[PDB]
Amino acid sequence: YVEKSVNSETKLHKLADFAIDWAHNNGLILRTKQFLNKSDVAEFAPVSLLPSPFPRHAFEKAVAVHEALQLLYFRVACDYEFMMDAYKDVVNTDNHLRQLVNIIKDAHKQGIKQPTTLLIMRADYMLNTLYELKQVEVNTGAIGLGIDRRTTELHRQMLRKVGMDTSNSPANNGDSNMIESLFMAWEAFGNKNALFVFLSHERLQYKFELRNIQCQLEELSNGQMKVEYVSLKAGYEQLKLGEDYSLLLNGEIVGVVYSTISALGHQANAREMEARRTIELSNAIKAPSLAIAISSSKKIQQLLTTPGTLERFFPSATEADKVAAIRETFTGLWGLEKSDDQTERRIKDAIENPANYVLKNFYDEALAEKLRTMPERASHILMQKLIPMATKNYFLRPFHEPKLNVVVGELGVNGTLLGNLRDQSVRHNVQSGHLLRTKLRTGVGDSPYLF
Amino acid sequence: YVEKSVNSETKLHKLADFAIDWAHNNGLILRTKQFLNKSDVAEFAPVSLLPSPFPRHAFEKAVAVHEALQLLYFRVACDYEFMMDAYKDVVNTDNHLRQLVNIIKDAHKQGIKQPTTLLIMRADYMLNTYELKQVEVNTGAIGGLGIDRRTTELHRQMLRKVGMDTSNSPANNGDSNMIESLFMAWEAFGNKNALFVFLSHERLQYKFELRNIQCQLEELSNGQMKVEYVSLKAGYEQLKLGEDYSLLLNGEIVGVVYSTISALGHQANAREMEARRTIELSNAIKAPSLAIAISSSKKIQQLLTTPGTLERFFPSATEADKVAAIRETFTKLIPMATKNYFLRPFHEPKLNVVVGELGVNGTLLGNLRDQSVRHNVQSGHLLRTKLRGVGDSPYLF
Numbered sequence: 001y002v003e004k005s006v007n008s009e010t011k012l013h014k015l016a017d018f019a020i021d022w023a024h025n026n027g028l029i030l031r032t033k034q035f036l037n038k039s040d041v042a043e044f045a046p047v048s049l050l051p052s053p054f055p056r057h058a059f060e061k062a063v064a065v066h067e068a069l070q071l072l073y074f075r076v077a078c079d080y081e082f083m084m085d086a087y088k089d090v091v092n093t094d095n096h097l098r099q100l101v102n103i104i105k106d107a108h109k110q111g112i113k114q115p116t117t118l119l120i121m122r123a124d125y126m127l128n129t130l131y132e133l134k135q136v137e138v139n140t141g142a143i144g145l146g147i148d149r150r151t152t153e154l155h156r157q158m159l160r161k162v163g164m165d166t167s168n169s170p171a172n173n174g175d176s177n178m179i180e181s182l183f184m185a186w187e188a189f190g191n192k193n194a195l196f197v198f199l200s201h202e203r204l205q206y207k208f209e210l211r212n213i214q215c216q217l218e219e220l221s222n223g224q225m226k227v228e229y230v231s232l233k234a235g236y237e238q239l240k241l242g243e244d245y246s247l248l249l250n251g252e253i254v255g256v257v258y259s260t261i262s263a264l265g266h267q268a269n270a271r272e273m274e275a276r277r278t279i280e281l282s283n284a285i286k287a288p289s290l291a292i293a294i295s296s297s298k299k300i301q302q303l304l305t306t307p308g309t310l311e312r313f314f315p316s317a318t319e320a321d322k323v324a325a326i327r328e329t330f331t332g333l334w335g336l337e338k339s340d341d342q343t344e345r346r347i348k349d350a351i352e353n354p355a356n357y358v359l360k361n362f363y364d365e366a367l368a369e370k371l372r373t374m375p376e377r378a379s380h381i382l383m384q385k386l387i388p389m390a391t392k393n394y395f396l397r398p399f400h401e402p403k404l405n406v407v408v409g410e411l412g413v414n415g416t417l418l419g420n421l422r423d424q425s426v427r428h429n430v431q432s433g434h435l436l437r438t439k440l441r442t443g444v445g446d447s448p449y450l451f
Numbered sequence: 452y453v454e455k456s457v458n459s460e461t462k463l464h465k466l467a468d469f470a471i472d473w474a475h476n477n478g479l480i481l482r483t484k485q486f487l488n489k490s491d492v493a494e495f496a497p498v499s500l501l502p503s504p505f506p507r508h509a510f511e512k513a514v515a516v517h518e519a520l521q522l523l524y525f526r527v528a529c530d531y532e533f534m535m536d537a538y539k540d541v542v543n544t545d546n547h548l549r550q551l552v553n554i555i556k557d558a559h560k561q562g563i564k565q566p567t568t569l570l571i572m573r574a575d576y577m578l579n580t581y582e583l584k585q586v587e588v589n590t591g592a593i594g595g596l597g598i599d600r601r602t603t604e605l606h607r608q609m610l611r612k613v614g615m616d617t618s619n620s621p622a623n624n625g626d627s628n629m630i631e632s633l634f635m636a637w638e639a640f641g642n643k644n645a646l647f648v649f650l651s652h653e654r655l656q657y658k659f660e661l662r663n664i665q666c667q668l669e670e671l672s673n674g675q676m677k678v679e680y681v682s683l684k685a686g687y688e689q690l691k692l693g694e695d696y697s698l699l700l701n702g703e704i705v706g707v708v709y710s711t712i713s714a715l716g717h718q719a720n721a722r723e724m725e726a727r728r729t730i731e732l733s734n735a736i737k738a739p740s741l742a743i744a745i746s747s748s749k750k751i752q753q754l755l756t757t758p759g760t761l762e763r764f765f766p767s768a769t770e771a772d773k774v775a776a777i778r779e780t781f782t783k784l785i786p787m788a789t790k791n792y793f794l795r796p797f798h799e800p801k802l803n804v805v806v807g808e809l810g811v812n813g814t815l816l817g818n819l820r821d822q823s824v825r826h827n828v829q830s831g832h833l834l835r836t837k838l839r840g841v842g843d844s845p846y847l848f
Contacts, residue, residue: 020490021658024480024493025659025662025663026478029475039475039495040471040495040797042475042480043493207472208475208476211472223611398491398492
């Protein structure tokens with residue numbers, strides 16, 4: 001439909017020019033690459049011109065499973081023994097992970113000072129044509145929900161400009177749930193003079209998004225919430241543990257620490273690591289806690305696909321629907337350290353039908369040859385090959401002429417969960433917000449047009 | 452109060468950083484100096500950190516006289532003989548003005564094809580050391596009313612950040628009146644397929660503001676209003692007069708031409724002048740018409756101060772209050788000085804002694820044939836502030 005809708009270069013440029021102005025007028029913006037430390041100039045956030053086609057059934061399935069998925073990862077994060085078991089080996093050959101695990105060990109040894117925590121999740125999916133919905137990533141660490149909403153809103157404007165029906169563009173209000181969840185977390189701390197802290201880099205494209213969150217939180221609190229920004233580097237000097245286990249930022253009590261510095265992604269130096277430790281040992285409500293953040297590493301994602309493992313976290317028969325709904329979104333994955341029957345027959349099928357698999361990258365005849373003659377097995381993993389649905393769209397990026405390209409995407413589904421780490425109870429578990437991230441076959445922001 | 456409120460460089464920068472982010476998040480923006488033809492990047496509009504002190508009495512006086520002032524200039528614009536009399540001499544030593552006057556002559560000779568017109572006015576004032584003095588009247592290319600509103604809104608945020616009362620910051624909704632007035636003008640043309648045209652430069656800082664007006668007009672019309680942009684240069688090729696005196700933009704009827712290209716300010720070439728003539732001879736509703744635009748030249752401003760001349764345009768005794776209120780604002784002027792911080796892209800904010808001018812905005816929708824007036828509203832204001840400039844808004848005392 002995108003190619004049919006845009007029938008000339010004149011129309012393309014009128015549409016793009018409207019879109020770019022709309023983006024700036026409505027906060028669909030980022031700091032520039034030249035000045036990631038300054039807000040004096042902004043550029044529009046890179047987006048598709050129109051919302052990419054996406055099947056309704058796959059979308060509704062991804063949305064429907066999300067709350068169950070958040071409950072799963074919350075329970076994983078609460079299961080100290082499972083997490084320590086999952087990390088036993090990789091800690092000995094990854095110093096960064098070792099330090100993070102040691103902070104969780106220190107926090108657990110001293111007893112949980114703050115039971116309330118806020119999980120924030122984006123689950124990523126792709127549409128396999130070799131359509132079926134397949135989970136490809138879970139992110140519980142540093143999570144642009146305002147940008148996603150504004151992208152949906154831009155796309156409705158653009159749909160009207162080409163005479164298309166906007167009812168197939170689904171509602172996208174993830175930022176409202178986020179703000180409410182963060183406000184609820186701050187109220188739960190029980191001190192109206194306690195700070196709300198954005199743990200964040202000095203260099204960041206998304207500063208405008210964070211400021212929007214600040215303004216909304218200040219409005220919700222009727223001006224009572226004091227908001228501050230600090231990095232882990234600056235935090236080494238400015239953050240301290242009080243004698244009552246309060247987190248003190250330059251001597252003032254911190255009620256909530258909302259992190260946009262990825263626990264797994266950011267290679268922190270020794271000082272940054274100590275600042276992280278100070279935060280984790282404090283009684284501040286963490287959004288998210290470190291355990292929540294590392295509950296969704298690739299290792300744990302893989303472990304959760306093994307036989308019987310979902311059932312450990314959903315032991316009751318009343319939750320069998322949640323198990324089935326999550327499992328049917330799993331990508332086929334078979335670690336070759338195991339020599340059980342299901343893995344062995346899988347190896348044989350991959351040798352005979354190598355076009356259907358990937359070995360980790362080996363493909364087709366090379367994959368088959370490697371499986372035939374590899375002794376080496378424990379480090380390799382066999383997976384189902386995924387072929388994404390292709391469509392066509394125009395990308396808007398600052399100073400790039402828009403062109404029609406063949407594109408593929410991933411669906412992101414967002415939500416929050418507010419829970420108690422001591423008894424594993426859940427006060428709030430909501431799916432809200434989504435996005436498409438679209439690339440040529442980093443890519444651009446996008447939103448679904450349901451069919 | 453500004454100096455007392457900001458008691459450290461650390462606080463100053465936290466406030467400024469909040470303000471700059473707020474500006475970008477809320478559309479208080481301009482195209483960059485490097486790329487006045489492109490919207491890919493934007494900078495925040497230059498503003499004061501806090502609203503400058505301004506006396507309430509002077510402000511209320513400037514607001515109160517505004518509708519009378521719009522009625523005055525509308526009646527001047529309707530008085531063909533007065534305008535031709537006023538320009539008899541200056542046309543012989545100002546070729547630019549001569550060409551504009553000749554277009555009005557050509558339009559008048561053929562009979563007025565479109566009686567409905569929209570006057571848009573900014574009146575500028577300064578505080579003489581206080582008494583309110585009118586220094587300029589602008590009935591040509593106005594714009595920036597959304598920027599003025601957002602500046603007021605930013606200033607309320609900043610007042611709260613330093614614990615000051617926001618009730619002395621007056622309401623600033625000039626953009627709503629503008630949009631309603633332009634929509635009313637478009638409805639009055641009587642053709643739901645007729646275009647709304649922004650007559651505008653390809654290079655312009657305020658493009659974001661115009662797009663905002665477009666979106667609001669599209670919303671008000673329930674998607675029926677088709678909006679286009681054209682310059683006078685491109686207009687020379689793309690605008691024509693139809694055999695029924697319709698203004699045609701690439702063959703499509705134009706219902707309203709809203710101008711942000713100043714009639715008196717922009718030194719137009721021959722082609723641009725012909726495009727202007729084509730617009731003026733058409734039946735499109737002009738916002739504003741050329742007669743309205745040149746009704747507020749410096750020459751006419753001066754002529755309106757001479758004895759008995761206001762009374763020619765307000766002949767009735769029932770309008771004697773309007774005459775007195777306008778005449779009281781007539782004029783060496785020494786402006787009130789205060790202190791403030793300026794926020795400009797890539798400039799560190801510093802405390803300076805500053806002076807300003809008050810701008811008061813409004814619209815008037817009227818009929819050029821019988822001089823009747825359907826709509827006459829003051830709405831919107833601004834401060835423009837300079838070292839003894841930037842956008843600013845008043846803190847009334």
